[PDB]
Each structure stands twice: as C-alpha cells, then as structure tokens.
Amino acid sequence: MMEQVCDVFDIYAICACCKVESKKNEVFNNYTFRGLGNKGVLPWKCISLDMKYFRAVTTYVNESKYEKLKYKRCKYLNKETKKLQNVVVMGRTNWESIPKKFKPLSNRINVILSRTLKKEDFDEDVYIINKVEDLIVLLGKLNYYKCFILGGSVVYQEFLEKKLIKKIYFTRINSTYECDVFFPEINENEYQIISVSDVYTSNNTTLDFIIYKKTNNDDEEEDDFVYFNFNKENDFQIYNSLKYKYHPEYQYLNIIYDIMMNGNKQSDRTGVGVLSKFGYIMKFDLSQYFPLLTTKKLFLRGIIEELLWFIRGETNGNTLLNKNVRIWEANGTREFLDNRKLFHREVNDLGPIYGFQWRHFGAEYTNMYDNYENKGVDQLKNIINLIKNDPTSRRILLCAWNVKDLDQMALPPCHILCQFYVFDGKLSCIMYQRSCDLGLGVPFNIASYSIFTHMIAQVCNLQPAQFIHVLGNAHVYNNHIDSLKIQLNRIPYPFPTLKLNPDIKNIEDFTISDFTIQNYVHHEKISMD
C-alpha cells in the first residue's frame, strides 16, 4: 500500500537523556535514561560531546542523495519534478530555552510549534506552525534533506503518538540530575535499537549514542570483492539485528560469539569440555570509561581485595576468606593441595603464586607465614621505578610465570605478564593471559587489570590510557553456553567510571575504601550454570 508520512518526509527525533533522581539493588532497563529537562532548562551544565554530535547530525546533508528524496516526495504528493539544509522542529518552550546567540540554529531550517505565539512575535528567520498537520504541509513545500524533531517533552510525545518518527537518535547520558520533564516510554513493539556507539567521557560523565528504528511490524571493483571470496566454505536474533555494534563491550561479546560459532570442541583438564580458540586481543580506553561488563551484573569488592593481597606479597588464603572473598578457596583445600602432590602444604597455603612472584621472584618459598623482606626480586617496585625514571624503557614487565616454582603453586598463573608503556604522561598496560575462561574469569580479569592500570598510573603521576588484553587459549565452557546465549542478546549500557582516592601516592597504601565505581548501569545477574 501507500507508505507512511515519517518515511516520505524523513522525520526523526534526536534527544539526550540522563538518569533521574528517586532514592543498593536497583533495576535498570532502557527507561532508566529518560530525563530531558528541569525548570525550563537542561538538567546538566554542558555536555559538549553531545552538543557536537547533535550539531553533526542535525546539519549533515548528502546532496547526491537528494534527487531520490525529491522524486519520492513529489511522487507521494502526485507531482512532477541556498545550499541544501535539514529542517529542525522545536517546541515553544524548547525554542525559549536556547540563548539568543544560538537562534536560529545555524545551517538549518528552523520551525517552532506554538499556539500562543505567531510570526509577529519573532524577529528571526523561522517558520511558526500551530498544528502538527501544518508541519507536514510545509515539508511538501520545502527543499530539504531531513527533518529532526529537536524536542520538548510535549513535542516528542505527540510525534511518537502520531507515529511520525522513523528513527530516534538517543543519547544516554550516564549520570543523575534533577529532572521535571521526561522522554516518553518507548514501546519495544514499535521501536528497536539498531545501533550503539563507542563510549565516551565528556564533562565528568560517560555517555553513548544509540539509534532506535521503527519496527518491521563505483561499480567494477565490487565484483572483484566477490571473486576474492571464492574460497569461503537463530540463537542470537537480537545480537545479529544490530547494525553498528561499536560499544567496547562488543569486543568481549564478539569473541564469545566467535568461539560459539567457530570454536574447536575440546576436552580440558576440568572434564566439562569447551569450545576454544587461540589468540585474541581486546583494547579498552580507560581515559574514556571503566570497562565493567554491563550485560550482566559484576561486583568489584573481591577482585580489589585480591589485588591488594597481591600487592602485599601474600600467599595466605585465610586473609581473603576472613574478608569473605572466596576466589581462592577451592584452590587451597586439603583435597585440592593433595591432588597437586602438595601433601606438606597447610590448607590455604597457596604457595609462591602472584603476590610472592611480584614481590619476591626467585626467593625459596617456605610457608605462608615466613618473612620474605628483601628476598628475591621485587618486580613490583622495579616496574614503578622504571615507569617513573625510565618511562621509554621496553622492559617494564611484571612476570608471574616463574618456571621453577610452577609445581609449588596451588595452580600455575593464568595472567602471565604485564607490560607497561608510557607516552606523553599516559600509562598503557598489556596483560597476556594464557588461559581464559570467557564466561566467568575474563569479565573479572578485565576489571582487575583495569583497576591495576589506574593504581599504577596514579602512584606514577600519569593518566591511564589503554588496557590491552591478550588472550591465548580462549575457551567457553559447555555449562556456560546457554547463559551466554542469553547474555549476547542483551544490549550494553554506557560504561561506569572508577574513582581512586587521589591522596594515595604509593602502591602499598591503597585500601578497599579508596576505590569507587560510579554510575554502574547493568542488566541482571546471570548464574553461568
């Protein structure tokens, strides 16, 4: 049949939404991001990246695309056939919140909705309209590329109600501010997310940009591509329905996907069996976000305590258990130690694992209570020294794989080494991981080495840049498959941030209350079994 008005006239909404104030265990969904305005203005001071994106989207035209849009509009209306511009439509209140120096919005055809004001009341080159229908009539008369509904709660509400919106360009501002007006609850039957962007920081908040779409209910050289592909040989509907998956959480999600679809079926030490592949790299920009997975719920207390226990050079499992952190519990039982032929090892004496190697590489391990002060190589101090005093060194490495002591460890380390890189007052870190449990271990391990990059950067007067995560044997356990099918069909939220107490200037001086995660928005806890 004859198609609808949003399509012919290319009418979109663009908005920015923050999180809203209503005061441990809270539930997040798309509706979490809904705050539009407060007391006639925006809830926040300035978010310049959203303003830059807004400007980019609302001013962009493709001239060679116009001809086809022209024909289409003419055809729909039964008709023969300055620089091209977009139309922008604002509510009256919206129009009045904008400072005069910015009105009318440059390089766009401005249009205000109003009953109480008429063309006489405006000095500016703008079109006044008093009915939504009158917008449509105008779009028939104007030459323009696209039409963006710039907002106002009232304006948004009515355009979505009359189904005049083809795509919503929606910015998720990942912070909380006092709000009095709200974006309307979007119906999932009517609109689905098709694109999610990278995550960014601007003005002390993370944000991303997503695109909702209205639901389904040269010439020679492109042939050369098909030639070069001559030798190419249901569970992820949502995951596969996304056009642009640029959120960095997709680095992790794409690897699971790849292991699930193309991984090798293998037995393993545990007896569970896995799907495995060999050799991946992920990169997280810590200047922009803290990459805590949002597709399921993670907590950070344990892994921080673990890291503090590493830095103190400890190998005593009782220390963790006494803080109700059980990450190493299974690896310290009588039964487990005896299976490792460690019959003369005390329960929870984990042997010369991470802490011991970081502080005392090469010392003879005795028992977990011994005093090892000044024995072996204090690699941790050495790397901090090298970062401060020879930042361009290519030898800044922290290594836990001590070949000589492997058999005395409760189990050999998975996280083999850290290599550090300094440029322009910024610290980056590569961690190489020999064995990577994708469903359970990896999300924690990303968090751990991201925290440790921040710690090391701070005590060295640098800013953290990239955590780069190298996976050797990357594997999905079979008892994890169904849980990860659920996970890969969840859409990430903008990442949270990590704040460290800025007064901590030595690696040893950190305690648990020196760390806070801010603005963690996540899907529900999944049990992997």
Ligand X SMILES: NC(=O)c1ccc[n+]([C@@H]2O[C@H](COP(=O)([O-])OP(=O)(O)OC[C@H]3O[C@@H](n4cnc5c(N)ncnc54)[C@H](OP(=O)(O)O)[C@@H]3O)[C@@H](O)[C@H]2O)c1
Ligand Y SMILES: CCc1nc(N)nc(N)c1OCCCOc1cccc(-c2c(N)nc(N)nc2CC)c1
Residues forming the annotated binding site?
A: 16, 36, 38, 40-41, 92-94, 114-116, 131, 152-155, 158, 269, 394-395, 414-415, 433-435, 437, 445, 475, 477
Q: Which H, E and C letters describe 414-469, residue by residue? A: CEEEEEEEEECCEEEEEEEEEEEECCCHHHHHHHHHHHHHHHHHHHCCCEEEEEEE
Least distance (Å) between residue 204 CB and ligand X: 17
Partner in contact with 411, chosen from ligand X, ligand UMP, ligand Y, none, beta carbon below 5 to 8 Å by kind:
ligand UMP
Q: How many CB atoms lie within 10 A of CB 4?
A: 12
Q: Which of 6, 414, 429, 436 is catalytic?
A: 414
- Examine residue 42 and tell whether it contacts ligand Y (CB under 6 A): yes
Residue 91 binds ligand Y, judged by CB under 6 A = no
442, interface contact from ligand UMP, ligand X, a second copy, none, CB < 5-8 Å by kind: ligand UMP
Buried-exposed string 160-199: b where 16+ CB fall within 10 A, e elsewhere? beeebbbbbbbbbbbbbbebebbbeebeeeebbbebbbeb
CB of 417 to a second copy, least distance (A): 7
Closest C-alpha among 209, 205, 159 to residue 186: 159
- Near ligand Y in 160-219, by CB under 6 A: 171
Q: Which residues of 231-264 are buried (b: 16+ CB within 10 A; e: fewer)?
A: eeeeeeeebeebeebebbbbbbbebbbebbeebe
Sole binder of ligand Y in the list 6, 8, 11, 15 (CB under 6 A)? 15
| Cα–Cα distance, 95 to 97 (Å, whole number) | 6
CA distances from 365 to 310, 332, 368, 404, 416 (A): 16, 16, 8, 11, 19
74 counts as catalytic: no
Distance of closest approach, residue 462 Cβ to a second copy, in angstroms: 14
In the complex with ligand UMP, the residue whose CB is nearer, 254 or 479, is 479
Q: Six-digit token pair at 143?
A: 């030459």
Q: Are 428 and 467 in contact (CB under 8 A)?
A: yes
Is beta strand 127-129 parallel, antiparallel or unpaired with respect to 108-113?
parallel
- Give the nearer residue to a second copy in terms of CB position, either 49 or 117: 49
Question: Using CB under 6 A, which residues numbered 144 to 163 contact ligand Y?
Answer: 150-151
Nearer to ligand Y, 47 or 165 (CB): 47
| Ranges within 401-430 binding ligand UMP (CB under 6 A) | 411, 414
With CB under 5 to 8 Å by kind, the binding choice for 379 among ligand UMP, ligand X, ligand Y, none is none
Site for ligand Y in 342-371 (CB under 6 A): none
Tell me which stretch binds ligand Y (CB under 6 A): 45-53, 240-248, 478-486, 493-501.
Answer: 45-53
Nearest to residue 143, comparing CAs of 193, 85, 102? 85
Cα(415)–Cα(386) distance, integer angstroms: 21
Residues contributing to the site for ligand UMP (CB under 6 A) = 269, 394, 411, 414, 435-437, 441-442, 445
Residues contributing to the site for ligand Y (CB under 6 A) = 14-16, 42, 47, 50-51, 54, 94, 97-99, 102, 105, 150-151, 171
Residues contributing to the site for ligand X (CB under 6 A) = 15-16, 36-37, 40-42, 91-94, 97, 113-117, 130-132, 150-155, 158, 181
Active site residues: 414
